[PDB]
Amino acid sequence: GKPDKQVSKLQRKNKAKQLRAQRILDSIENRKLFEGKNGAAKIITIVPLVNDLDPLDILYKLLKCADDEGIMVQEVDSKRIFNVHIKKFKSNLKIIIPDMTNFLNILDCAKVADFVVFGLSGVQEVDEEFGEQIIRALELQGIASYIGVISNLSAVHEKEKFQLDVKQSLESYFKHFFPSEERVYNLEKNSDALNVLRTLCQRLPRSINWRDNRGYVVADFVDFVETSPDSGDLVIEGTVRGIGFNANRLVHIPDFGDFQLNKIEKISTVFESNMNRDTLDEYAPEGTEDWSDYDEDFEYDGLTTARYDDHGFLPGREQTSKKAAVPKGTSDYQAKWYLDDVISPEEEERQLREFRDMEKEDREFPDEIELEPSESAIERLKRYRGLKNLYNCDWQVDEKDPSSPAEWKRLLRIGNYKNTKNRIIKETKNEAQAIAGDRIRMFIRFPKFLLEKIQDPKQLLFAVYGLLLHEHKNAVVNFSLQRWEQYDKPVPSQEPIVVQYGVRRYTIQPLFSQGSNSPNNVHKYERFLHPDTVSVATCIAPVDFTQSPAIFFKPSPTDAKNIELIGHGTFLNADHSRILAKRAILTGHPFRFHKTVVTVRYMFFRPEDVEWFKSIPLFTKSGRSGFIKESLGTHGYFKATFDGKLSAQDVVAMSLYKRMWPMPSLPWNG
Amino acid sequence: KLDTSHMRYLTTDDFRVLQAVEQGSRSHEVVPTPLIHQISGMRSQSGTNRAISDLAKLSLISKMRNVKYDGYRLTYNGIDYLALKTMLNRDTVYSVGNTIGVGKESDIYKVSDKNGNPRVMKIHRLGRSNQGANWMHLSRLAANKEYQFMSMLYSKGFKVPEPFDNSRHIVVMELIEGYPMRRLRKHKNIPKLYSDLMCFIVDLANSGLIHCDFNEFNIMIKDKLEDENDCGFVVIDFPQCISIQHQDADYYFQRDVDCIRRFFKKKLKYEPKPDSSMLDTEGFGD
Amino acid sequence: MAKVHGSLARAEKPKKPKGRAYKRLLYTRRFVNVTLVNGKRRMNPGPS
Amino acid sequence: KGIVLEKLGIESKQPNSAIRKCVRVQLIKNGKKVTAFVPNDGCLNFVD
């Protein structure tokens, strides 16, 4: 075939020099996005973590160490967003200071940044309930390059010997959440200030996955043009960062919604959206046409026994030949032997107490039902199933049920998420008309009446985010869900809980399950979130194709931040194949004992009920299997056989299952 | 003996492991623990040892620790439930439980299928247990034999129970709403039924067989209608059958005929007018 | 987990002694006050 | 240093089945793919 290799000095040196020349070229290309003379836009957001602290001051320091008194004086008058060009390092910074009365405004501010500066107090210890949560939440949603900086250090003792103490304790506090850094810089000293400015100018900012793969424009100027009396064109002048925008793809705007593009112009050509337009509709009308073959439309009314025919008994036929005997007053027995032929604060408090109680009850006793004597067990569980192995038998996704949501057909049924994600992201990269580093006029179609809420792009951040294919289309989504730190409180699986993934926020009544992998993709429905481990939250919500981290919260007006941070996690899967079975356990006491047959008590109250559940297996929390034999009395006592020998301290139980359906979601604003 | 019930205690995994011991005992005598661990195609000691604990508790396997030689021994129940599992897979049996027919080398139970159509199960027990290779092997060959004979009996038109399946030493057959010559009291057309039962032995010696034992309890009689009285003459006889070349075929055939005529003479008081068919005519007939 | 900024030093069951002291403790845990259990020197037993 | 290419669920059978929660990592300096263990972590909530 081919001979071998004997690399010489020269060959080696060259392969090296080439590798490194290539490396250098690529690095220059990747460091050309911030050519601080014409094409740059380094977004630095200033986030103080202490109430008694001023951000304007922090900026004042950084730009007074640039020896530019004018650019400082011109900003005091009226602004909060600035376009500051530093000549010392030749760079185009954009500074953003958040409304520190709005939590979500802080998050929105930082989540667009290339840099996050953290203000720290030498006087006041950071708040456990507010500033700390700023840290953690920023950290979870995504952060590019962050820095730890101080201003209040002079407020302590005048001698450096005591100031450095505070500094270092702050360093060890700051290291805890942000180990990437070890040096909290002091602006009081000219050196450190000059150095942090230096870094902000020079140092290349790392990448945050989800925001960089769909593009974003921070708006400097927002004007409106009337076209029709009821709607017009929002014009947005801003520089594109990230992957870029296409005229056909939709654009999200936070606390406003998803809108479609009409025109885009560049000022570093004109592109207009054509016929390949993504449409402003959730449930695509093609989704109705995709789910056409309804496979199982089973009629539980046409059942004499529990649906379990796959592993149970046989269809027993009870042909009833009822004739009437005419002796006045006579038992059903004599009659059976005469005609035989052969051929607001109070509400919340009470409810919440009850939810804690039901949750702890659900820990001590999982999914058990209490049937009453008057209750006909058959009817009460008539719709249920009774599978032997929950991960082996054949549940199906395409089953029709009056409990199923009307929209279920009209949903975006992605076959494979891992591949679809990659394909569509490559499409977006290739079909990007407007790349990163471009200044853009963006003409978006827009309903007039919302113009009232739109603020000024200089006092309030106005960000413009890109969406990918079909991301406006709803789907069945699975999130990873993990509880926030120091949060003991209960969270049931049907209550409204706001979810932020990407930059989009949707209120969600999510079904909680354990993501334990199953061969039949069937998972236990957990009524309340597990207090220890990662869980899964499934619901009907618009798709996300970059696996954005998700923040779960419930808006609480009382707290400083008008948000109770419940949990976090990630957008896992756009999958419908995940089915969720609400389990239902029936409890019974093993009354009497014979060397192979155990008489069991208080699990039914009619003999016919016992007939109805014959095939369904019996399991004991002692870890033992068994089955029913026949009904003893007219009170529902039933004889039973088992695997091991059970005492009166055991509990005989039945497991019955029902289909649980995901719920529709609505966007969340304000 | 057979306790079919217990089979619905086992999962996919316990059958998996039991199958592994079935492939491992037909390769080596006493299948050791590591053989079952490596052949089963399983994950860990978890699944296999839990499975084997289940099988050993439910008497499907026996632990043989012979001076460091640890191994296992598949009981008859194991083979039973593996044939029965193979049939659960081949959609042939769905429920079992009613014993009519306690033979020496055959057990006859009453079974059912997916559709609810009643059938019969003839398992074969050679030696019933001190299990070697020959007991299980020759029981397996026994039911193979009887099922093939049965298939050739149904194929050629004979009124013999239609053989549905032959899961190893077990055989699934058709249930036949019939009554033996003991339970039968009287008939509407006894000469026609005799003509039938003689024409049958004629056609059987025409095929090449002489079912040496053609007694009263052998012949089942199925009734199809109650108004018009339709009869069907089923016959259970295969390992006692004796080919038409054996040295002793003569008095076997003529014993069959003499028994037909002697019962038809006693119970129904009907003697045959035509002379009984001798062995010679049927020795030329084949 | 999170010790707050107040790590600024300047301006439960009994504890174990550190350093030298601890060794002393052990010297008497093993040689001055010997505990002979079942014909052996037992270290870390529960109920026996 | 390397960047996690793919989360691997390898399954290593005898004598003890590891539900191998391992990773495909690609080393930065070589561009060379490697498999690697991620210890002490039951859920892999740490490594994406």
JSON list of N, CA and C in Angstrom, two decimals, chain A residues 291 294 383 397-409 411 413 540 658-664:
[
{"chain": "A", "resi": 291, "resn": "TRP", "atom": "N", "xyz": [-51.07, 14.57, 11.99]},
{"chain": "A", "resi": 291, "resn": "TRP", "atom": "CA", "xyz": [-51.73, 13.57, 12.84]},
{"chain": "A", "resi": 291, "resn": "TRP", "atom": "C", "xyz": [-53.09, 13.18, 12.27]},
{"chain": "A", "resi": 294, "resn": "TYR", "atom": "N", "xyz": [-55.55, 8.16, 13.52]},
{"chain": "A", "resi": 294, "resn": "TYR", "atom": "CA", "xyz": [-55.88, 7.94, 14.94]},
{"chain": "A", "resi": 294, "resn": "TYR", "atom": "C", "xyz": [-55.93, 6.44, 15.18]},
{"chain": "A", "resi": 383, "resn": "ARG", "atom": "N", "xyz": [-62.13, 4.20, 33.88]},
{"chain": "A", "resi": 383, "resn": "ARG", "atom": "CA", "xyz": [-61.32, 4.64, 32.76]},
{"chain": "A", "resi": 383, "resn": "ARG", "atom": "C", "xyz": [-59.87, 4.17, 32.88]},
{"chain": "A", "resi": 397, "resn": "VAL", "atom": "N", "xyz": [-48.95, 6.80, 22.21]},
{"chain": "A", "resi": 397, "resn": "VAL", "atom": "CA", "xyz": [-49.00, 8.25, 22.27]},
{"chain": "A", "resi": 397, "resn": "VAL", "atom": "C", "xyz": [-50.18, 8.79, 21.49]},
{"chain": "A", "resi": 398, "resn": "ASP", "atom": "N", "xyz": [-50.58, 8.01, 20.49]},
{"chain": "A", "resi": 398, "resn": "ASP", "atom": "CA", "xyz": [-51.57, 8.42, 19.49]},
{"chain": "A", "resi": 398, "resn": "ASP", "atom": "C", "xyz": [-53.00, 8.00, 19.84]},
{"chain": "A", "resi": 399, "resn": "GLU", "atom": "N", "xyz": [-53.27, 7.83, 21.14]},
{"chain": "A", "resi": 399, "resn": "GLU", "atom": "CA", "xyz": [-54.58, 7.36, 21.59]},
{"chain": "A", "resi": 399, "resn": "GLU", "atom": "C", "xyz": [-55.56, 8.52, 21.74]},
{"chain": "A", "resi": 400, "resn": "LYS", "atom": "N", "xyz": [-56.79, 8.32, 21.28]},
{"chain": "A", "resi": 400, "resn": "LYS", "atom": "CA", "xyz": [-57.79, 9.38, 21.37]},
{"chain": "A", "resi": 400, "resn": "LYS", "atom": "C", "xyz": [-58.64, 9.27, 22.64]},
{"chain": "A", "resi": 401, "resn": "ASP", "atom": "N", "xyz": [-58.80, 10.41, 23.30]},
{"chain": "A", "resi": 401, "resn": "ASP", "atom": "CA", "xyz": [-59.39, 10.48, 24.63]},
{"chain": "A", "resi": 401, "resn": "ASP", "atom": "C", "xyz": [-60.05, 11.85, 24.84]},
{"chain": "A", "resi": 402, "resn": "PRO", "atom": "N", "xyz": [-61.28, 11.87, 25.38]},
{"chain": "A", "resi": 402, "resn": "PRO", "atom": "CA", "xyz": [-61.98, 13.13, 25.71]},
{"chain": "A", "resi": 402, "resn": "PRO", "atom": "C", "xyz": [-61.20, 14.03, 26.66]},
{"chain": "A", "resi": 403, "resn": "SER", "atom": "N", "xyz": [-60.24, 13.46, 27.39]},
{"chain": "A", "resi": 403, "resn": "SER", "atom": "CA", "xyz": [-59.41, 14.22, 28.31]},
{"chain": "A", "resi": 403, "resn": "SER", "atom": "C", "xyz": [-58.25, 14.90, 27.58]},
{"chain": "A", "resi": 404, "resn": "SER", "atom": "N", "xyz": [-57.85, 14.33, 26.45]},
{"chain": "A", "resi": 404, "resn": "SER", "atom": "CA", "xyz": [-56.80, 14.90, 25.62]},
{"chain": "A", "resi": 404, "resn": "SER", "atom": "C", "xyz": [-57.20, 16.30, 25.16]},
{"chain": "A", "resi": 405, "resn": "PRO", "atom": "N", "xyz": [-56.23, 17.23, 25.14]},
{"chain": "A", "resi": 405, "resn": "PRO", "atom": "CA", "xyz": [-56.48, 18.61, 24.72]},
{"chain": "A", "resi": 405, "resn": "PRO", "atom": "C", "xyz": [-56.80, 18.70, 23.23]},
{"chain": "A", "resi": 406, "resn": "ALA", "atom": "N", "xyz": [-57.72, 19.59, 22.87]},
{"chain": "A", "resi": 406, "resn": "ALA", "atom": "CA", "xyz": [-58.21, 19.72, 21.51]},
{"chain": "A", "resi": 406, "resn": "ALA", "atom": "C", "xyz": [-57.09, 19.93, 20.50]},
{"chain": "A", "resi": 407, "resn": "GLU", "atom": "N", "xyz": [-56.04, 20.60, 20.95]},
{"chain": "A", "resi": 407, "resn": "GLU", "atom": "CA", "xyz": [-54.96, 21.02, 20.08]},
{"chain": "A", "resi": 407, "resn": "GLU", "atom": "C", "xyz": [-53.99, 19.90, 19.76]},
{"chain": "A", "resi": 408, "resn": "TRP", "atom": "N", "xyz": [-54.07, 18.81, 20.53]},
{"chain": "A", "resi": 408, "resn": "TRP", "atom": "CA", "xyz": [-53.04, 17.75, 20.53]},
{"chain": "A", "resi": 408, "resn": "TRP", "atom": "C", "xyz": [-52.59, 17.30, 19.14]},
{"chain": "A", "resi": 409, "resn": "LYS", "atom": "N", "xyz": [-53.50, 17.37, 18.17]},
{"chain": "A", "resi": 409, "resn": "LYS", "atom": "CA", "xyz": [-53.20, 16.98, 16.80]},
{"chain": "A", "resi": 409, "resn": "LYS", "atom": "C", "xyz": [-52.38, 18.06, 16.12]},
{"chain": "A", "resi": 411, "resn": "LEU", "atom": "N", "xyz": [-50.07, 19.89, 16.71]},
{"chain": "A", "resi": 411, "resn": "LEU", "atom": "CA", "xyz": [-48.78, 20.17, 17.32]},
{"chain": "A", "resi": 411, "resn": "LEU", "atom": "C", "xyz": [-47.61, 19.80, 16.41]},
{"chain": "A", "resi": 413, "resn": "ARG", "atom": "N", "xyz": [-44.76, 17.95, 15.46]},
{"chain": "A", "resi": 413, "resn": "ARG", "atom": "CA", "xyz": [-44.21, 16.65, 15.83]},
{"chain": "A", "resi": 413, "resn": "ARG", "atom": "C", "xyz": [-42.84, 16.37, 15.22]},
{"chain": "A", "resi": 540, "resn": "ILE", "atom": "N", "xyz": [-47.23, 21.85, 26.93]},
{"chain": "A", "resi": 540, "resn": "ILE", "atom": "CA", "xyz": [-47.43, 22.35, 25.57]},
{"chain": "A", "resi": 540, "resn": "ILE", "atom": "C", "xyz": [-46.98, 23.81, 25.47]},
{"chain": "A", "resi": 658, "resn": "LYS", "atom": "N", "xyz": [-53.49, 5.92, 34.61]},
{"chain": "A", "resi": 658, "resn": "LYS", "atom": "CA", "xyz": [-54.27, 6.73, 33.68]},
{"chain": "A", "resi": 658, "resn": "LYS", "atom": "C", "xyz": [-53.38, 7.64, 32.83]},
{"chain": "A", "resi": 659, "resn": "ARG", "atom": "N", "xyz": [-53.83, 7.96, 31.63]},
{"chain": "A", "resi": 659, "resn": "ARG", "atom": "CA", "xyz": [-53.10, 8.88, 30.76]},
{"chain": "A", "resi": 659, "resn": "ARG", "atom": "C", "xyz": [-53.22, 10.32, 31.24]},
{"chain": "A", "resi": 660, "resn": "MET", "atom": "N", "xyz": [-52.08, 10.99, 31.35]},
{"chain": "A", "resi": 660, "resn": "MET", "atom": "CA", "xyz": [-52.05, 12.39, 31.75]},
{"chain": "A", "resi": 660, "resn": "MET", "atom": "C", "xyz": [-51.56, 13.25, 30.60]},
{"chain": "A", "resi": 661, "resn": "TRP", "atom": "N", "xyz": [-52.30, 14.32, 30.32]},
{"chain": "A", "resi": 661, "resn": "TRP", "atom": "CA", "xyz": [-52.02, 15.13, 29.15]},
{"chain": "A", "resi": 661, "resn": "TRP", "atom": "C", "xyz": [-51.39, 16.47, 29.50]},
{"chain": "A", "resi": 662, "resn": "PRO", "atom": "N", "xyz": [-50.42, 16.90, 28.69]},
{"chain": "A", "resi": 662, "resn": "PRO", "atom": "CA", "xyz": [-49.78, 18.21, 28.84]},
{"chain": "A", "resi": 662, "resn": "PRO", "atom": "C", "xyz": [-50.80, 19.33, 28.69]},
{"chain": "A", "resi": 663, "resn": "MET", "atom": "N", "xyz": [-50.48, 20.51, 29.20]},
{"chain": "A", "resi": 663, "resn": "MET", "atom": "CA", "xyz": [-51.44, 21.61, 29.17]},
{"chain": "A", "resi": 663, "resn": "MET", "atom": "C", "xyz": [-50.93, 22.80, 28.36]},
{"chain": "A", "resi": 664, "resn": "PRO", "atom": "N", "xyz": [-51.85, 23.56, 27.76]},
{"chain": "A", "resi": 664, "resn": "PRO", "atom": "CA", "xyz": [-51.52, 24.71, 26.91]},
{"chain": "A", "resi": 664, "resn": "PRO", "atom": "C", "xyz": [-50.86, 25.85, 27.69]}
]
